[PDB]
Structures are given as structure tokens and as C-alpha cells.
Write a protein that binds this ligand. Sequence first.
Ligand SMILES: [Mg+2]
Ligand SMILES: [Mg+2]
Ligand SMILES: [Mg+2]
Ligand SMILES: [Mg+2]
Ligand SMILES: [Mg+2]
Ligand SMILES: [Mg+2]
Ligand SMILES: [Mg+2]
Ligand SMILES: [Mg+2]
Ligand SMILES: [Mg+2]
Ligand SMILES: [Mg+2]
Ligand SMILES: [Mg+2]
Ligand SMILES: [Mg+2]
Ligand SMILES: [Mg+2]
Ligand SMILES: [Mg+2]
Ligand SMILES: [Mg+2]
Ligand SMILES: [Mg+2]
Ligand SMILES: [Mg+2]
Ligand SMILES: [Mg+2]
Ligand SMILES: [Mg+2]
Ligand SMILES: [Mg+2]
Ligand SMILES: [Mg+2]
Ligand SMILES: [Mg+2]
Ligand SMILES: [Mg+2]
Ligand SMILES: [Mg+2]
Ligand SMILES: [Mg+2]
Ligand SMILES: [Mg+2]
Ligand SMILES: [Mg+2]
Ligand SMILES: [Mg+2]
Ligand SMILES: [Mg+2]
Ligand SMILES: [Mg+2]
Ligand SMILES: [Mg+2]
Ligand SMILES: [Mg+2]
Ligand SMILES: [Mg+2]
Ligand SMILES: [Mg+2]
Ligand SMILES: [Mg+2]
Ligand SMILES: [Mg+2]
Ligand SMILES: [Mg+2]
Ligand SMILES: [Mg+2]
Ligand SMILES: [Mg+2]
Ligand SMILES: [Mg+2]
Ligand SMILES: [Mg+2]
Ligand SMILES: [Mg+2]
Ligand SMILES: [Mg+2]
Ligand SMILES: [Mg+2]
Ligand SMILES: [Mg+2]
Ligand SMILES: [Mg+2]
Ligand SMILES: [Mg+2]
Ligand SMILES: [Mg+2]
Ligand SMILES: [Mg+2]
Ligand SMILES: [Mg+2]
Ligand SMILES: [Mg+2]
Ligand SMILES: [Mg+2]
Ligand SMILES: [Mg+2]
Ligand SMILES: [Mg+2]
Ligand SMILES: [Mg+2]
Ligand SMILES: [Mg+2]
Ligand SMILES: [Mg+2]
Ligand SMILES: [Mg+2]
Ligand SMILES: [Mg+2]
Ligand SMILES: [Mg+2]
Ligand SMILES: [Mg+2]
Ligand SMILES: [Mg+2]
Ligand SMILES: [Mg+2]
Ligand SMILES: [Mg+2]
Ligand SMILES: [Mg+2]
Ligand SMILES: [Mg+2]
Ligand SMILES: [Mg+2]
Ligand SMILES: [Mg+2]
Ligand SMILES: [Mg+2]
Ligand SMILES: [Mg+2]
Ligand SMILES: [Mg+2]
Ligand SMILES: [Mg+2]
Ligand SMILES: [Mg+2]
Ligand SMILES: [Mg+2]
Ligand SMILES: [Mg+2]
Ligand SMILES: [Mg+2]
Ligand SMILES: [Mg+2]
Ligand SMILES: [Mg+2]
Ligand SMILES: [Mg+2]
Ligand SMILES: [Mg+2]
Ligand SMILES: [Mg+2]
Ligand SMILES: [Mg+2]
Ligand SMILES: [Mg+2]
Ligand SMILES: [Mg+2]
Ligand SMILES: [Mg+2]
Ligand SMILES: [Mg+2]
Ligand SMILES: [Mg+2]
Ligand SMILES: [Mg+2]
Ligand SMILES: [Mg+2]
Ligand SMILES: [Mg+2]
Ligand SMILES: [Mg+2]
Ligand SMILES: [Mg+2]
Ligand SMILES: [Mg+2]
Ligand SMILES: [Mg+2]
Ligand SMILES: [Mg+2]
Ligand SMILES: [Mg+2]
Ligand SMILES: [Mg+2]
Ligand SMILES: [Mg+2]
Ligand SMILES: [Mg+2]
Ligand SMILES: [Mg+2]
Ligand SMILES: [Mg+2]
Ligand SMILES: [Mg+2]
Ligand SMILES: [Mg+2]
Ligand SMILES: [Mg+2]
Ligand SMILES: [Mg+2]
Ligand SMILES: [Mg+2]
Ligand SMILES: [Mg+2]
Ligand SMILES: [Mg+2]
Ligand SMILES: [Mg+2]
Ligand SMILES: [Mg+2]
Ligand SMILES: [Mg+2]
Ligand SMILES: [Mg+2]
Ligand SMILES: [Mg+2]
Ligand SMILES: [Mg+2]
Ligand SMILES: [Mg+2]
Ligand SMILES: [Mg+2]
Ligand SMILES: [Mg+2]
Ligand SMILES: [Mg+2]
Ligand SMILES: [Mg+2]
Lengths: 96, 99, 82, 122
Amino acid sequence: RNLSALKRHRQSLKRRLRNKAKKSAIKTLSKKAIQLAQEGKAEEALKIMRKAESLIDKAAKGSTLHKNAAARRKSRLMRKVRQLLEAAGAPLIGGG
Amino acid sequence: PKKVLTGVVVSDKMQKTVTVLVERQFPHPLYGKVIKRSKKYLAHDPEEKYKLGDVVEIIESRPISKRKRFRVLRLVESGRMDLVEKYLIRRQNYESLSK
Amino acid sequence: MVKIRLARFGSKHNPHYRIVVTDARRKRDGKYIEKIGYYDPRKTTPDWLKVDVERARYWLSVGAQPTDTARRLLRQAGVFRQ
Amino acid sequence: MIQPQTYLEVADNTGARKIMCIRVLKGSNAKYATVGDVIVASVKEAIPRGAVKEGDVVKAVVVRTKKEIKRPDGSAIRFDDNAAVIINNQLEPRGTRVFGPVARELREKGFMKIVSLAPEVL
RNA sequence: CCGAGGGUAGGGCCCGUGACUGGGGCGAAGUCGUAACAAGGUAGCUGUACCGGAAGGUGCGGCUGGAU
RNA sequence: AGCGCCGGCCAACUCCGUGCCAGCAGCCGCGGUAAUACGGAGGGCGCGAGCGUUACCCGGAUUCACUGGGCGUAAAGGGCGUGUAGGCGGCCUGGGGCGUCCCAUGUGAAAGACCACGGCUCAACCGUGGGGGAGCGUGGGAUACGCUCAGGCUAGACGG
RNA sequence: UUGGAGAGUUUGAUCCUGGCUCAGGGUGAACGCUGGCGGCGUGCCUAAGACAUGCAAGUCGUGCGGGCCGCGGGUCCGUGGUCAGCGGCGGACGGGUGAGUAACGCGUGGGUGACCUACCCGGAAGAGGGGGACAACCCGGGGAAACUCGGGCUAAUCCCCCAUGUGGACCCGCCCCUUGGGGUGUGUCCAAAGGGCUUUGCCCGCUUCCGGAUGGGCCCGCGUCCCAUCAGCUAGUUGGUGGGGUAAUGGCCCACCAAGGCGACGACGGGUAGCCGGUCUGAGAGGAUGGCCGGCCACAGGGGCACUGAGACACGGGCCCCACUCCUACGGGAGGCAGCAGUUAGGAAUCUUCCGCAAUGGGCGCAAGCCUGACGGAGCGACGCCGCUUG
RNA sequence: CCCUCGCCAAGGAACUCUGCAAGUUGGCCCCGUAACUUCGGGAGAAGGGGUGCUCCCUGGGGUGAUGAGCCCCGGGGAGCC
Ligand SMILES: [Mg+2]
Ligand SMILES: [Mg+2]
Ligand SMILES: [Mg+2]
Ligand SMILES: [Mg+2]
Ligand SMILES: [Mg+2]
Ligand SMILES: [Mg+2]
Ligand SMILES: [Mg+2]
Ligand SMILES: [Mg+2]
Ligand SMILES: [Mg+2]
Ligand SMILES: [Mg+2]
Ligand SMILES: [Mg+2]
Ligand SMILES: [Mg+2]
Ligand SMILES: [Mg+2]
Ligand SMILES: [Mg+2]
Ligand SMILES: [Mg+2]
Ligand SMILES: [Mg+2]
Ligand SMILES: [Mg+2]
Ligand SMILES: [Mg+2]
Ligand SMILES: [Mg+2]
Ligand SMILES: [Mg+2]
Ligand SMILES: [Mg+2]
Ligand SMILES: [Mg+2]
Ligand SMILES: [Mg+2]
Ligand SMILES: [Mg+2]
Ligand SMILES: [Mg+2]
Ligand SMILES: [Mg+2]
Ligand SMILES: [Mg+2]
Ligand SMILES: [Mg+2]
Ligand SMILES: [Mg+2]
Ligand SMILES: [Mg+2]
Ligand SMILES: [Mg+2]
Ligand SMILES: [Mg+2]
Ligand SMILES: [Mg+2]
Ligand SMILES: [Mg+2]
Ligand SMILES: [Mg+2]
Ligand SMILES: [Mg+2]
Ligand SMILES: [Mg+2]
Ligand SMILES: [Mg+2]
Ligand SMILES: [Mg+2]
Ligand SMILES: [Mg+2]
Ligand SMILES: [Mg+2]
Ligand SMILES: [Mg+2]
Ligand SMILES: [Mg+2]
Ligand SMILES: [Mg+2]
Ligand SMILES: [Mg+2]
Ligand SMILES: [Mg+2]
Ligand SMILES: [Mg+2]
Ligand SMILES: [Mg+2]
Ligand SMILES: [Mg+2]
Ligand SMILES: [Mg+2]
Ligand SMILES: [Mg+2]
Ligand SMILES: [Mg+2]
Ligand SMILES: [Mg+2]
Ligand SMILES: [Mg+2]
Ligand SMILES: [Mg+2]
Ligand SMILES: [Mg+2]
Ligand SMILES: [Mg+2]
Ligand SMILES: [Mg+2]
Ligand SMILES: [Mg+2]
Ligand SMILES: [Mg+2]
Ligand SMILES: [Mg+2]
Ligand SMILES: [Mg+2]
Ligand SMILES: [Mg+2]
Ligand SMILES: [Mg+2]
Ligand SMILES: [Mg+2]
Ligand SMILES: [Mg+2]
Ligand SMILES: [Mg+2]
Ligand SMILES: [Mg+2]
Ligand SMILES: [Mg+2]
Ligand SMILES: [Mg+2]
Ligand SMILES: [Mg+2]
Ligand SMILES: [Mg+2]
Ligand SMILES: [Mg+2]
Ligand SMILES: [Mg+2]
Ligand SMILES: [Mg+2]
Ligand SMILES: [Mg+2]
Ligand SMILES: [Mg+2]
Ligand SMILES: [Mg+2]
Ligand SMILES: [Mg+2]
Ligand SMILES: [Mg+2]
Ligand SMILES: [Mg+2]
Ligand SMILES: [Mg+2]
Ligand SMILES: [Mg+2]
Ligand SMILES: [Mg+2]
Ligand SMILES: [Mg+2]
Ligand SMILES: [Mg+2]
Ligand SMILES: [Mg+2]
Ligand SMILES: [Mg+2]
Ligand SMILES: [Mg+2]
Ligand SMILES: [Mg+2]
Ligand SMILES: [Mg+2]
Ligand SMILES: [Mg+2]
Ligand SMILES: [Mg+2]
Ligand SMILES: [Mg+2]
Ligand SMILES: [Mg+2]
Ligand SMILES: [Mg+2]
Ligand SMILES: [Mg+2]
Ligand SMILES: [Mg+2]
Ligand SMILES: [Mg+2]
Ligand SMILES: [Mg+2]
Ligand SMILES: [Mg+2]
Ligand SMILES: [Mg+2]
Ligand SMILES: [Mg+2]
Ligand SMILES: [Mg+2]
Ligand SMILES: [Mg+2]
Ligand SMILES: [Mg+2]
Ligand SMILES: [Mg+2]
Ligand SMILES: [Mg+2]
Ligand SMILES: [Mg+2]
Ligand SMILES: [Mg+2]
Ligand SMILES: [Mg+2]
Ligand SMILES: [Mg+2]
Ligand SMILES: [Mg+2]
Ligand SMILES: [Mg+2]
Ligand SMILES: [Mg+2]
Ligand SMILES: [Mg+2]
Ligand SMILES: [Mg+2]
Ligand SMILES: [Mg+2]
Ligand SMILES: [Mg+2]
């Protein structure tokens, strides 16, 4: 009745924690930054936007995000922030 | 290569899409005779430039929608409403094949 | 990885391998990527071994890994002579 | 308080879904069956190809009731339906699982086989 | 939110079965008659229609695949 | 050493028993007191660690017919018109080259199959080599017939 | 041009039409009567019914820290083994089955400027500096079991932060290119793990990039059975705009907008079937078939779901619902042979609870090696073919 | 005790000649709706969902003047008890 498949399930549970955890933050922040950029609030948007971009590429280092997801996530972030600022402008920090 | 086919536009009642009817001949696999069979392709026309009656070429393309996997390649001839009639008269005849 | 090994053909108590390049995850006697020679362990004919050597060096050159008892039948045909 | 005409849910897998009481087997002239009592019943609704079929006259022990049963310790328990498990002449379920809880009263009345198969006993 | 499924209600197709019932095939050792095959003893056949224990008959119109 | 068969198809014949019985049977048919046709027997024919039966597939079936059938009376012409789709379509000349045809090239895995050789004492089985194909992609080419566009005609058809 | 036989039976007789019938080959066969040997094959076609027991997936101390027994010898140390744990890599292969599916499932040829790919190979560069968790372990609570709850401790190839930027990712501009292909400038963002020897040197690793190789995802043309006594079907339906999602296109999902899409070239519906390489027959054309072997697909008691991951929506992993069965101390809990054998039911009918990792192959490992019901062999059965005997 | 009326545990027609009587159902809006048919119907078949208030956005009509005010018929969103 036993296995080390058990072990393998034991671990999956734990990786799952770190993953979910990581993806939550990425969404929390992009949203936070898109939210700012709508009412922009130019400098602050861009500030958080970097903090997302960091967090994205950081998840992409491992198994959480496939690198293209990171690419895709990042692309859609920047597109949103910028085009939001165009209803008002102008970009306070970097970037870019 | 990407498959290219030539046909008549039979519908433009969609936005940014035309229905292009492609026809083909081939010998019957047993009875020899050359027989025709036709088929409609939904073709991407981002420019809404192709119109009813146009004879056109369409090229197999990366999928645009469910059912749309061809873009219109280029115009070939304009105003073949006589073909569009052929198609339409057949559909219209269907009202007589029921019960 | 892609591998070079022996696919058992022939029959019972009558081996006849084909030195062959296949994906490691194939079955033994499965679809191979390419045949490149054969081997008769019972040695029952003038040429109980043969190898396209020009080829076996390509697959090696591009990363194929031979089995142990294939490495040998590739040495014995001097695909390793430097 | 089950009486002739009362419909009961059947809490087993005999295939009977609903039975209607036709008699309470408790003496010469009992007015009501409660938990642990045996009735005779008609099968009014069953599923296809079970042990039992609509029309069958079977026996069943009442295993939970919508009128609350009171207990010597001053408490009472009440269920959301009236349910009975179909039995044979030796009080053994004719079925092989029993669904939903059952009243502990069944045990003191020698329905051990039913009490054990039950997911819960309240 | 969606969601396995559960429940309620109304539909569609299919299969099994049913008091009784309609003809059908066969069997054949029976009853009744002899409608068709000969001009088959009323030429036949026919669509329809009415009718008769039964094959059938008669009307109307048709065909000859009718003998003399 | 067994099993089927011995009326015809189909290779293999006599005696007894039975008497429209018992029974055989794939089709035609056998048995009602001289049965090569039932049952046994002798003998015979065919196969042989097999022989027979049942089932199913193709075959014979040109009996769904493309190769390769038919419709007065054998089964089979729609009761008759009108006409939609479709299928099919006269003579001459050009353009296009879709069908069609040619060449090249890719693909057409391995096994199997086919030809050669070879290994198990043979074979089956198994190995090495050889030979290709339809079909589809690509490049090039041909233009008679079919197609398509274009221009002529009058024998089809329509009209005065 | 290596290929083509027919016969019986409608009549008193005839010719013709026409059905029935037969001789041939074939099979995963079965039944009867009989039965000696060997070889190669080959054997649940029915209940994708239900299954007792063993076995079918693990490995690494050259990632880490402990326990228990011993070896070496002064409490401590080393060394070996063994046992879990943490950490890898495998477990997505391999093996079974054919239920579902008439579909881009399969076949064949194509497309991806719309994509991914662990371990393998080639080439470019790199490994500085910090901090933390959780088991094992000690301490309590709960059971008959399954087991688990809580308190605290500790290591690492575990986790995180900063540093470093060859490079790589992303927005904007611009050049080539022309669907999202390649290049470039500014801004922003992202690396890491070390272990081992013979120890200023090598081996196995770890990191980011580029290319390769292999394996895949998706897309399109054409082909793929019976019923028209199924003729009409369609509201995520057909298209569009924006977003969501993915590796990636897409009504795959969602909001809004338009009113479209399909159908006698047979939609919709019903029935039946996994498809192919092939197989069997046939002169051929064709018909029939898809068992064994190879390829793809689909499924893992019936259903739904996602997690982990390069890869799964995972046969011997997880969650939930159902059905069934079992266990128990009656409180509770457990299972999924369509893996190999084996039992039972069903059936006209289909095998040993065998042996071995020696060979080929696969997994982990520097290696020794360990695991391997894949496989290699052996057993049963005239089931088939081939060979041989009873002279 | 009778009349008229309100409620009722579990059951739910077992009442009785008979569900007699009383329950149930109940308006409007939307979805949806069978046999059969004289093609009207059967149909309010059946069955089901919605129904208050608050804020924001919004479409058309009447009266005006084309506008404001007034009156009429809507739609979409977010919420509250
Ligand atoms: Mg492990
Ligand atoms: Mg949040
Ligand atoms: Mg992931
Ligand atoms: Mg990644
Ligand atoms: Mg689109
Ligand atoms: Mg009944
Ligand atoms: Mg639902
Ligand atoms: Mg439902
Ligand atoms: Mg449920
Ligand atoms: Mg009768
Ligand atoms: Mg007469
Ligand atoms: Mg007469
Ligand atoms: Mg007469
Ligand atoms: Mg008459
Ligand atoms: Mg009379
Ligand atoms: Mg009369
Ligand atoms: Mg006339
Ligand atoms: Mg014979
Ligand atoms: Mg013969
Ligand atoms: Mg003879
Ligand atoms: Mg006798
Ligand atoms: Mg005699
Ligand atoms: Mg005979
Ligand atoms: Mg005889
Ligand atoms: Mg023999
Ligand atoms: Mg036949
Ligand atoms: Mg013949
Ligand atoms: Mg034929
Ligand atoms: Mg013909
Ligand atoms: Mg004929
Ligand atoms: Mg006529
Ligand atoms: Mg008529
Ligand atoms: Mg015409
Ligand atoms: Mg024409
Ligand atoms: Mg012509
Ligand atoms: Mg051409
Ligand atoms: Mg070719
Ligand atoms: Mg081949
Ligand atoms: Mg050939
Ligand atoms: Mg030889
Ligand atoms: Mg060969
Ligand atoms: Mg010409
Ligand atoms: Mg002309
Ligand atoms: Mg003329
Ligand atoms: Mg006769
Ligand atoms: Mg006659
Ligand atoms: Mg005769
Ligand atoms: Mg004949
Ligand atoms: Mg036998
Ligand atoms: Mg025997
Ligand atoms: Mg054997
Ligand atoms: Mg099976
Ligand atoms: Mg069953
Ligand atoms: Mg069972
Ligand atoms: Mg073992
Ligand atoms: Mg290591
Ligand atoms: Mg060891
Ligand atoms: Mg360990
Ligand atoms: Mg597999
Ligand atoms: Mg196998
Ligand atoms: Mg199947
Ligand atoms: Mg279907
Ligand atoms: Mg298709
Ligand atoms: Mg395809
Ligand atoms: Mg992995
Ligand atoms: Mg520490
Ligand atoms: Mg950093
Ligand atoms: Mg919508
Ligand atoms: Mg889009
Ligand atoms: Mg994925
Ligand atoms: Mg859709
Ligand atoms: Mg079509
Ligand atoms: Mg049809
Ligand atoms: Mg079905
Ligand atoms: Mg099936
Ligand atoms: Mg023939
Ligand atoms: Mg088949
Ligand atoms: Mg079969
Ligand atoms: Mg297979
Ligand atoms: Mg399933
Ligand atoms: Mg499942
Ligand atoms: Mg099962
Ligand atoms: Mg399950
Ligand atoms: Mg698994
Ligand atoms: Mg699973
Ligand atoms: Mg799956
Ligand atoms: Mg698997
Ligand atoms: Mg299993
Ligand atoms: Mg206990
Ligand atoms: Mg539990
Ligand atoms: Mg078990
Ligand atoms: Mg077995
Ligand atoms: Mg049996
Ligand atoms: Mg076997
Ligand atoms: Mg081994
Ligand atoms: Mg090995
Ligand atoms: Mg290794
Ligand atoms: Mg073993
Ligand atoms: Mg009451
Ligand atoms: Mg009540
Ligand atoms: Mg009631
Ligand atoms: Mg009630
Ligand atoms: Mg009564
Ligand atoms: Mg009474
Ligand atoms: Mg009444
Ligand atoms: Mg009343
Ligand atoms: Mg009322
Ligand atoms: Mg009211
Ligand atoms: Mg009322
Ligand atoms: Mg009704
Ligand atoms: Mg009506
Ligand atoms: Mg009525
Ligand atoms: Mg209503
Ligand atoms: Mg209502
Ligand atoms: Mg009010
Ligand atoms: Mg409300
Ligand atoms: Mg209020
Ligand atoms: Mg007024
Ligand atoms: Mg106004």
C-alpha cells in the first residue's frame, strides 16, 4: 500500500503554495499600477509597474511562469499603462 | 506552400468577411467521368473591398476565427453575378425539396 | 535524448539486431529515426556486423548517445579511430 | 407517527424509492409507527430493475421520522423526513447499503445490521 | 460565475410486452362450391363502384394478353 | 492410425437387414419386400496426426455489371406535358493552360509482399541486398481533345 | 500482357430468362471421432462484468541533516551498513485495452511571420555577498487500524534578497523584412549550487543566451460506412471591435455590435465502426476485413476537476460526486488487474498464481550497481503453418 | 351547545354516496407549452422564472416651440432590507 509517489504529492502541494503566492502578487501589482495609470498619477504608476515587471520576470526564472507568459504579461502591462497616461500624460519616471 | 484557391464571392453580409465559393473537377474514382464538387470558404477581408460577384483567389492562412482560416489573396475578376445566380437559384430551389 | 542502439529482430534463440538511431523513449523494436547497420551476435555469416560509419558519426556529432554494447560495435567498426 | 397512507422515503438500495404504509405491525390495532417499528407497505415508486418493484407489498422498519422522538434523558431528535429500510421476515435489510442517518433507537430494537451500515447514528 | 450530478415538469425516438383482434405463410388426410386455364361452358383481364357464404357478380369506362 | 466419402454434381459397388418405417439430405432427391441413395458388412475412393462438421469472409455471381448486365412479350419506360438544378452539346480562328499528357525532384517509415542470395541438417521461421508503384507537394514543358475567355460562321435551333 | 474452367435443379422434350445449391481459398476459431514427435508462430473475438494474493517504478551518500546495529580506537571521532526524512532525476516512457469517437480521429500532402521541447550535442559567457522556512529529530494530545493534531529544534543542489549583465524579456522610435521574421538606440526587468577527488588542477553538477537534434501543439487541401420511411438545421449560432487565456492561432472563454453560418455536392437526425501500414480473396477491377507486428488516436470502475511539471488534466499521483464491494474494536476506514499470472461470471471458446535480468532496451547513478511481469526464455493447448515417425 | 371566523404536531382523503365542505391556485411581466383538430383552436394547456426600495447611466412619445417644466412607455448598471 505505499510509495514515494506520496513524497511526490507532498512536494507538489508545497510548490503549489509558492506558485499561487507568486501569481497573486503579480496580478495585485499590475492591477495596482494599471489602476494608477488610469487616474495617472504618472510617477506612481510607473513606479509600481517596475515592481510588477520585476516580480513577473522573477517568477519566469522558475516553473511558475513560462518565460513567454512573462513576456506576454509584461507586454500587456506596458501597453495598458502608457495608453492610459495618453489620456493626460506625461511620463514622470522610467520606463520606457 | 500555402494552398491557394480561386472562387466567387457569394456573400458579403458579414462584416470583414466574404464567403468564397471554390469549385473543382476530378475523375470519379470508379465511374471515370469528370465530376464537379464545390465548397464555401469564409475569407478574411479586413478592408471590406471585395464585393459580391468578385472572382478572387484566397490563400490558406493562420486562423482568424472559427471557420475562417483563409485571407483573400487578391482580386481576379469583377462582376460575375451570373455565378452568384447559379448558387442562389440552387439555394432558392431548396424550398421545393421539403415536406 | 536521441539514441543509437540495437533493435532485436530475427526470432527465438536466433537474434539479429539492427544498429539503429531511435528516440530513447521509443519501444525497442519501434519506429526508428533511421537504420544505420546491423549485428549478428551468433556471428553466423561472413559479415555478422556492418555499420554506415559516415552516418553514425553524424548522429554522434549532433548528440546521439550510443548504448554500451553499441559503443563497442561502433569501436569494432572503428567509428572511434582518431 | 407513520400511519396507513403515509409515504416514506426508503433509505436503502433495494431500488424502492417511495413506499406507502399500509399497516403498522405493532399489535392488534396500533395507530402509529415510530422509529424501530415495522410496517407493511406498498411500493409506490421504485427505479428500474431493483430487488423491488412498484406494486410490491413489503415490510420495512422505520428508521427516521419527521415527528420528533423523545428520549429518557430529556432530549429529543427529529429528522427532515420519514424513512424506512426494507427488511425481510428476520429483520435483515433486503438491501446492502443504507443512506442517511438513523435513529439510535434501532439498535436497542435489534436492527444492528441496519444500524451498522448507516453512515451516522443520532 | 461556471460547474459533476441531483430534483421537478413537459416533450421526441427506439425496444420489449398486452386482453383482444386483422389478415399472411404452411400443413393436410376435411366441408362447400367451380372463379381462371378450351369460346373453360356468361371471352378474359382491368380502374372504380355497389353487392354477395365463398371463389365471385353486376354497372361504367378501358385493353386484347379473345376463340368462332 | 485415424476420419470423411462411394446415387448425380464427385474419385470410389456388392451382400444382408429394413419395407413411405427406421432413417439420409448441401441442391436434385432417396425409402411403399431385389435400395449402388437408409443401417451394418466386405470391398473401394480421398486425405493422414490428422479427418470432418458448424459459423463467417471473398470466390464461382457478367446475380449491382467501372472492367462487365439489362427494361415489346421474361423483373424492368415515369399516364402525358411543361420546365428548375444538373448532365451533356455544331463548324472556323486566336489568347489562357483548369482537366489531360511528359520530364525532373521531394514524399511515398519499418515490417509484410515480389525477385536474388544466405542462416537454422530442410522447411516453417528468420537475415542481407534488389526492384518499383499509385497518390500528393514542387520546378519545368506540351496544346490535340474537354475547359475558359475573345472573334468569326450557318448545316442545329428560333423567327419573317 | 505468367492471367480468367464450371456443375446440379423450372420442361414430355427445347431454347431463354432467373433464383437457389455445390465443388475453391481463408480464420484469434469452435464442435465431433482420433491423436505419436519437434520447430516457429499463436491463444477471452463474449461482461470496457466483478475480482482473493503476490508481483508489474524506481534510483542517487559524488546534493543534506539525523536514527538504529556494527567496525575501526580516545565521551569523542572516523568507516561501513540499514531506515525513514529533506533534495534531485524518473514516475507523461515502457505495458494493457478498443469502451467512446463518422471526427482534422485517422490517412495522405502541406502550413506555423502563431508555437513548445527535460535529459543529449555544438558554440558564447558565468558562479561575488547576505538571510530564512520545513521535515527527520525531542515534547505533549487522538485511535483497533488508516493514521493524524499541536509545541519546539536543525542541514542542504530547498526558499529568498542584493550584487554582477555576455546575453535574454518588455514598451516607444527607426531600417531591412512582410501576419508576431531579423537588427538597432533610449528606459525598465531577470541568473546561479555546489559536491568530489589524486586538492593553484581535473571530474560530475549549477546559471543565462544562441544554434542544433529529437519528441510534440495548433492550422489547412483531399480521402474515410448504412438509413432521405432523418429535409431542413443553427443564439456562442456566423462575422466583427475590445479584452481574458495559452507555448501558440482561434467563439477556446467573456462584454458589446452586426445578422449572419450550414444544407439534396445531403446539413440536422438516427444506426454501426477506433483509423492506417497491412490482411484475406479475386484474372484483374473489385469485395471483405483491421486479431498478432508497426504507426497514430482514445480510454484507465462511471463522471467532473485541476495541482505538480519540459511534458499530464496523469492506469499502478491528487480532489470531489455516483455505483459496488470490503475491513473493523461498530467509533470509524479502505479499494479500482483494459499491467503479468491467477479467481469468478458470461460463453461454442481462449493459457503458467513458471524462470531470469544472461541477452536487447529503459530509469536513476562518477561508478560499483539497483529496479525492470518491458523483455529474454520455459509451461499448457494439433489453434495454425513447416518438418519427422509408426519402418 | 349553535352560528360565522382564525390557527394547529405527525399524517394527508385513511373522511364520505361524493374531496361534500375547506385548503391549494390566484394579478401583471417574461420564458415555455402535448395528444388531438373542423387548423380557429385545444391555451391562462402543463410547468417555471420575475415582482420592493435606493443611486448612476440611458431610449422613444404627448404638451410646449425644436427647449424648459409637466405627463406617458421603456432599457442597462450597481446596490439596500
Ligand atoms: Mg523519491
Ligand atoms: Mg487581492
Ligand atoms: Mg506550471
Ligand atoms: Mg520558464
Ligand atoms: Mg478574430
Ligand atoms: Mg404497474
Ligand atoms: Mg446545469
Ligand atoms: Mg442536468
Ligand atoms: Mg449529487
Ligand atoms: Mg391470430
Ligand atoms: Mg367469369
Ligand atoms: Mg368455369
Ligand atoms: Mg367463363
Ligand atoms: Mg368491374
Ligand atoms: Mg349465406
Ligand atoms: Mg348482383
Ligand atoms: Mg384507353
Ligand atoms: Mg470428403
Ligand atoms: Mg471433390
Ligand atoms: Mg464416379
Ligand atoms: Mg425398422
Ligand atoms: Mg434389400
Ligand atoms: Mg450419398
Ligand atoms: Mg449404403
Ligand atoms: Mg503434417
Ligand atoms: Mg457467397
Ligand atoms: Mg469456377
Ligand atoms: Mg462481382
Ligand atoms: Mg456497364
Ligand atoms: Mg440480366
Ligand atoms: Mg409511355
Ligand atoms: Mg402519377
Ligand atoms: Mg440548363
Ligand atoms: Mg458545359
Ligand atoms: Mg465544341
Ligand atoms: Mg494544365
Ligand atoms: Mg512518384
Ligand atoms: Mg516498404
Ligand atoms: Mg508489384
Ligand atoms: Mg539454405
Ligand atoms: Mg527484406
Ligand atoms: Mg489553343
Ligand atoms: Mg462563339
Ligand atoms: Mg437550318
Ligand atoms: Mg425438380
Ligand atoms: Mg413453367
Ligand atoms: Mg423432371
Ligand atoms: Mg442456373
Ligand atoms: Mg477437436
Ligand atoms: Mg480427447
Ligand atoms: Mg510453443
Ligand atoms: Mg476484450
Ligand atoms: Mg451485466
Ligand atoms: Mg458480477
Ligand atoms: Mg520484484
Ligand atoms: Mg552527483
Ligand atoms: Mg547498498
Ligand atoms: Mg534514502
Ligand atoms: Mg503507452
Ligand atoms: Mg504484447
Ligand atoms: Mg474502439
Ligand atoms: Mg452520427
Ligand atoms: Mg476532414
Ligand atoms: Mg490532414
Ligand atoms: Mg521534469
Ligand atoms: Mg541555517
Ligand atoms: Mg535583481
Ligand atoms: Mg454574447
Ligand atoms: Mg482577439
Ligand atoms: Mg499548459
Ligand atoms: Mg463555440
Ligand atoms: Mg459540398
Ligand atoms: Mg444520400
Ligand atoms: Mg450509440
Ligand atoms: Mg465500439
Ligand atoms: Mg471475378
Ligand atoms: Mg473494421
Ligand atoms: Mg477480429
Ligand atoms: Mg495494433
Ligand atoms: Mg471517461
Ligand atoms: Mg476515470
Ligand atoms: Mg473494469
Ligand atoms: Mg475514478
Ligand atoms: Mg501516473
Ligand atoms: Mg487519476
Ligand atoms: Mg488522458
Ligand atoms: Mg502510460
Ligand atoms: Mg491498475
Ligand atoms: Mg474503537
Ligand atoms: Mg477520512
Ligand atoms: Mg488488490
Ligand atoms: Mg487468465
Ligand atoms: Mg459456463
Ligand atoms: Mg504467451
Ligand atoms: Mg537487464
Ligand atoms: Mg542497460
Ligand atoms: Mg548515466
Ligand atoms: Mg519476476
Ligand atoms: Mg395538521
Ligand atoms: Mg405541518
Ligand atoms: Mg395526497
Ligand atoms: Mg402530500
Ligand atoms: Mg375510501
Ligand atoms: Mg370508510
Ligand atoms: Mg369523486
Ligand atoms: Mg368542492
Ligand atoms: Mg383559497
Ligand atoms: Mg388573491
Ligand atoms: Mg378561491
Ligand atoms: Mg397529452
Ligand atoms: Mg392546430
Ligand atoms: Mg381534451
Ligand atoms: Mg401560468
Ligand atoms: Mg409563477
Ligand atoms: Mg409601492
Ligand atoms: Mg430583486
Ligand atoms: Mg421598503
Ligand atoms: Mg391636449
Ligand atoms: Mg419635453
